[PDB]
Amino acid sequence: ELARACLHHMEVEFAIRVYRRIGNVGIVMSLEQIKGIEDYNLLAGHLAMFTNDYNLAQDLYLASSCPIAALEMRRDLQHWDSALQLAKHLAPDQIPFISKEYAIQLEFAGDYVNALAHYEKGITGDNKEHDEACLAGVAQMSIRMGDIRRGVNQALKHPSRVLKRDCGAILENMKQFSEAAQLYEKGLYYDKAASVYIRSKNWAKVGDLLPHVSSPKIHLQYAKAKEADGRYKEAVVAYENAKQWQSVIRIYLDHLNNPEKAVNIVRETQS
């Protein structure tokens, strides 16, 4: 009560003392940054922001020597319609950047239609890294909106390997295993790709990826699947890659009659 009253009556020195007594160090540090401000409207605006009255804070900032503080507060609060309206009057160059951060928030919130519109508005044509981050958002939102073609083609044409991972992840959440595995494959995430191809039961695609598959667990699932398919040659190389040496040992003995190859395995195991 005493603290809130000190903020409303603008007694910053008593507000500092009282929040220091309470042990709210965060508010002490922030008020110690404002203690030197003599502009009534700027000071009153910062204090209104600390009492969570954002509309009053905006009006006071606009009346102050520094209006840009209102845009910054609204951007910090992620109140994007108000931040865009302030940006149109005070800083037009920030509009594409604010539209990207708004499109990230709309992408998070589930409004994929407006997120896609705001990522397309966020394209500047000058800042390549920012435009790439907008095009990444367009690809991701085209995916979630069911234009999987537009979003996958964009993610393939785009220079980022991280976008290919993230589009692959969204597509696995959608159970779109083929396009998830394709974007992981084109992103050089060969293990993640192969694991999603195992979910799709595509032992042919996994077999093309196996020279790049690092995971023993993927080779082990493939070795089981190929033994069930009667492809003992493939299942052997896969159990060898998986370091499941005794399956290979039994196969070379019982099924292949090739025990010279059974012994070649044993020395690294000492089994």
């Binding site: 709210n24 160090v25 540090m29 993230d166 998986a242 005794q246 039994r250």
Partner: protein
């Protein structure tokens, strides 16, 4: 609590009153001696269920006088009232009679610790040492014969001395103990007792006589008198870790003697112990040093030999004991820290030690102990003993012998319902979604319980009873005869076990469906249900699982053998499954039936086992879809070296989250216990660690095993009962439930016997349910998986400012500032978002994360981060802002000397604001700003300023005071002070 199941032994109808009992020192088998009405003696061996072992019966026309099991082999020695000694071998089914050489009652019988020799002694004082083969047969003739001419009372072997406890030997010798020097000094041992560095015959021992004397015997068999007590010796022990003999007489006189290798004993102390003389006091020596006596009194008497301190433990009527109920016998389990005593009213009292587990925190005297609920039995209890490494106890009344097997009160939890067995015929049932508790008394000794949102099932191994919730009252829904060892439930379906089958039944016991096992798969003996899935486990360690989304239960997992999946496993100790049925978790047991440090997880879709071993921290993986005994894939992803001493004992899966799992693990104690040089609690010597750990895991096909949490089991909690988000479930101590609820006689006040603990990421968010539960479950999984974008996506439907605050607090630990900006925005924390944007002027991530920690009120983390950055400037500003000025000045004086004047100035300003002007002056002086700040501060109190100016004698201050006098027109005084200031101008 642990309830100890009373397996009354199946004594033959020809067996009379039991006389003595003896466990095998390792194996779960009990020898029992009987005296018939015709005074014939017999001996029988029993399994842990109290079943008599076939072909083990032994009888003679005269009484059993002594029993002694071999230390390691399945061999029993029996001594008889005639002087016959007989060795029985259970493995080979042979019995051998020793050469008739005694002519009187065998009062002493003891295996050597190597087990290669047996010692026998009679009432006439003839002592014989025998060598025996691996079958228990005598190799020729006695290695030793001696004739004391007096009744032999006790023998103990001196286990081959390595040199005391070697640190205690070294300290004793450095402190000038000439007998510790005689242990080190190799030239003086003319008897063949070198400090026994090898597989020596182990023929060093002490023997006592009824006159009160003790004789030592050396490796050559020479006898020397070591003690001469004033009465009959009631008990004898050897403190190996001190090379010291303890003697207790029937007049309750304790004496301790240090004994060198040569058998010339020297006395450490002699003390008259408290207690009633004229009864045979049973005595135990807990760990060495802690002497405990059951004198035939309403309390156990304790004497700490190393502190020279005494205390008592008495049974308390709050647990159901009677007033004045006397304890006749006492024994201690060293492995789990459990003290037991047998009463004249037929009860076993037990105290759990506040553990001397390898890191558990200690206590002094009586506070070393916590009284557990009684075990009630028939007739006056005359002897007890703790046995096999499972923590079994055996009990001998005037009427019968019982084997007591430890269980976690057979207890169960499912669907936010719990059932806790308060007594052999009483349950406390908690509907944890409503907070309501019910007391459910049964017409049977309950062997197990199972629970659901609608109904609870109980059984005794002859019948099953089922009870339905009917508003605010539990009512009997059915009761039927069924010999089931275990049971489970899903909706209106009951799952019961018979020979080679599981039977699905209605609540009235009507069989709906059969699930079949072959003789090679073994009998079912474990059941668990999670989500819509049943898992089943068998004797000789096979398992199966079934889908229950259909009334026809359907085979989800085909049969697997745990012994083929995991070599060296002796059995199953427990089974559970995931709420998807995709993963099964298994506690194996070793061939000696001890709990295994391994836990096994079987993937049903991949058809593979992953085995995690607590002793090594390794994860194995093995494959056998095709027949196999494979080499392990090995991953070193577990960094926690703290787990090496723990063993899993209970385990569970989340009923809603198939990726989420938990295990309880105990810190097991070694087979025999040492002591310290000082009188500390025996392993509680150091600072705290968990008596029992609770470990929770996320389990996935893409990332393997991830430790979600590790924590100590709460001090108010006796075991893990379950888990279902947001909560782990635990069994509460009735020792503590009565300490906050004030109660009066005349109402059956229901104790709150189930405690619950929130999961780490759910602390302060436990109101979470349904779709918010599923979102937070996905969040907790995805955060621990490290795929933070999926965690952040799972939260998108949650508007709660508290969830955004908890995620911001977790951004401080994960050092993820990008997500923290969005969290601060979603919570409306505009000052924190500004503070992070300004903190981007600092190049270090840790300094920026410290600003976030400061704005969230995490001051400890913030302090640690600023220290880690070496940013003593921001740390000083932080301390100032926290009002911790002394720490701020210390950091300024040692690491931030350039701000020290500014820090003194700011502190002086806060002291001035606090109306402490005197200390403000001292710090303005230290900041060298007293020339302008002091006159400003004291400008209202002119006399104090004048005193100050005259005290400092500073030139600049005399000029200022002269300017003040000059403006006031006091020119003669202004001149005086300008003359003092030497300001000639």
């Amino acid at each position: 609590m642990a309830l100890y199941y009373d397996h009354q032994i199946e004594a033959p109808d020809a067996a009379g009153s039991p006389s003595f009992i003896s466990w095998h020192p390792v194996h779960p088998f009990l020898a029992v001696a009987y005296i018939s009405t015709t005074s014939t003696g017999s001996v029988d061996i029993y399994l842990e269920q109290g079943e008599c072992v076939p072909d083990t019966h032994v009888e003679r026309p005269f009484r059993v006088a002594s029993l002694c099991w071999h230390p390691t082999r399945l061999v029993l020695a029996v001594g008889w009232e005639t002087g016959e000694v007989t060795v029985f071998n259970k493995q080979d089914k042979e019995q051998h009679t020793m050469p008739l050489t005694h002519t009187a009652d065998i009062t002493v019988l003891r295996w050597s610790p190597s087990g290669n020799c047996l010692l026998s002694g009679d009432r006439l004082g003839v002592l014989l040492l025998w060598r025996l083969d691996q079958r228990g047969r005598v190799q020729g003739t006695p290695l030793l014969k001696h004739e004391y001419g007096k009744h032999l009372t006790h023998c103990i072997f001196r286990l081959p001395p390595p040199g005391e406890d070697l640190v205690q030997l070294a300290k004793a010798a450095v402190s000038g103990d000439e007998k510790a020097l005689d242990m080190f000094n190799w030239k003086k041992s003319s008897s063949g007792s070198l400090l026994k560095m090898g597989s020596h015959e182990g023929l060093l021992f002490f023997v006592s006589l009824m006159d009160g004397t003790v004789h030592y015997v050396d490796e050559k068999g020479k006898t020397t008198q070591v003690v001469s007590a004033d009465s009959t010796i009631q008990m004898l022990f050897y403190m190996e870790k001190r090379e010291a003999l303890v003697v207790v007489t029937e007049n309750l006189r304790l004496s301790l003697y240090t004994v060198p290798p040569e058998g010339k004993a020297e006395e450490v102390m002699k003390v008259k112990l408290s207690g009633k003389t004229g009864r045979r006091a049973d005595i135990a020596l807990i760990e060495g040093s802690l002497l405990v006596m059951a004198v035939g009194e309403a309390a156990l008497r304790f004497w700490d030999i190393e502190r020279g301190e005494n205390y008592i433990l008495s049974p308390d009527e709050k647990f159901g004991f009677e007033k004045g109920e006397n304890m006749n016998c006492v024994c201690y389990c060293k492995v789990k820290g459990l003290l037991a005593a047998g009463t004249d009213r037929g009860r076993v009292a037990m105290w759990r030690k506040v553990p001397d587990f390898l890191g558990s925190p200690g206590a002094e005297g009586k506070d070393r102990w916590a009284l557990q609920t009684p075990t009630e039995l028939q007739g006056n209890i005359t002897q007890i003993q703790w046995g096999s490494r499972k923590n079994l106890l055996a009990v001998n009344s005037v009427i019968s012998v019982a084997i007591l097997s430890e269980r976690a009160m057979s207890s169960h939890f499912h669907q936010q319902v719990a059932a806790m067995q308060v007594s052999p015929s009483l349950l406390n049932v908690c509907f944890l979604s409503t907070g309501v508790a019910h007391s459910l008394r049964t017409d049977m000794h309950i062997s197990g319980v199972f629970a659901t949102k609608d109904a609870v099932a109980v059984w005794n191994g002859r019948q099953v009873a089922i009870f339905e919730l009917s508003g605010a009252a539990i009512r009997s829904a059915g009761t039927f005869l069924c010999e089931t060892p275990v049971l489970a439930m899903h909706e209106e379906n009951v799952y019961t076990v018979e020979s080679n089958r599981v039977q699905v039944r209605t609540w009235q016991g009507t069989v709906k469906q059969l699930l079949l096992f072959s003789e090679t798969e073994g009998n079912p003996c474990f059941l668990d249900i999670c989500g819509n899935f049943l898992v089943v486990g068998t004797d000789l360690a096979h398992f199966k699982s079934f889908d229950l989304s259909r009334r026809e239960a359907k085979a989800h997992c085909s049969c697997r053998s745990l012994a083929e999946l995991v070599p060296g496993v002796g059995g199953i100790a427990s089974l559970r499954c995931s709420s998807s049925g995709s993963t099964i978790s298994i506690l194996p047991s070793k061939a000696d039936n001890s709990p295994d440090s391994k836990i096994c997880f079987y993937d049903v879709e991949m058809d593979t086992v992953t085995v995690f071993d607590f002793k090594t921290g390794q994860i194995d993986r093995r494959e056998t879809l095709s027949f196999n005994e494979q080499e392990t894939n090995k991953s070193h992803l577990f960094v926690d070296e703290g787990l090496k001493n723990y063993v899993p004992v209970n385990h569970f899966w989340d009923q809603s989250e198939p990726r989420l799992f938990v295990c309880e693990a105990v810190q097991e104690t070694p087979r025999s216990q040492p002591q310290s040089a000082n009188g500390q609690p025996q392993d509680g010597r150091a600072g705290p660690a968990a008596d029992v750990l609770i470990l929770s895991f996320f389990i996935s096909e893409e990332h393997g095993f991830l430790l979600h949490e590790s924590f100590p089991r709460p001090a108010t909690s006796h075991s893990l009962l379950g888990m279902e988000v947001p909560y782990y479930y635990f069994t509460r101590k009735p020792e503590e439930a009565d300490r906050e609820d004030e109660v009066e006689p005349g109402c059956h006040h229901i104790p709150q016997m189930v405690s619950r603990r929130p999961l780490r990421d759910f602390v302060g968010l436990e109101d979470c349910d349904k779709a918010t539960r599923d979102a937070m479950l996905h969040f907790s999984f995805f955060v621990t998986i490290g795929d933070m974008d999926e965690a952040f996506k799972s939260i998108k439907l949650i508007k709660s400012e508290a969830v955004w605050e908890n995620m911001a607090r977790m951004c401080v630990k994960t050092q993820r500032l990008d997500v923290a900006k969005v969290c601060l925005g979603n919570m409306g924390h505009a000052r924190g978002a500004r503070a992070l944007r300004e903190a981007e002027q600092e190049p270090e991530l840790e300094a920026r994360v410290a600003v976030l920690a400061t704005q969230l009120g995490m001051l400890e983390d913030a302090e640690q981060l600023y220290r880690k950055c070496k940013r003593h400037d921001l740390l000083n500003k932080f301390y100032q802002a926290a009002g911790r000025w002394q720490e701020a000045l210390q950091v300024a004086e040692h690491h931030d000397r350039v701000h020290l004047r500014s820090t003194y100035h700011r502190y002086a300003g806060h002291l001035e604001a606090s109306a402490d002007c005197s200390r403000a002056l001292s710090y303005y002086e230290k900041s060298d700003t007293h020339r302008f700040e002091v006159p400003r501060m004291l400008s209202e109190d002119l006399p104090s300023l004048e005193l100050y100016v005259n005290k400092m004698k500073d030139k600049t201050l005399w000029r200022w005071w002269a300017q003040y006098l000059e403006s006031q027109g006091e020119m003669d005084a202004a001149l005086h002070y300008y003359e003092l200031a030497r300001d000639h101008f």
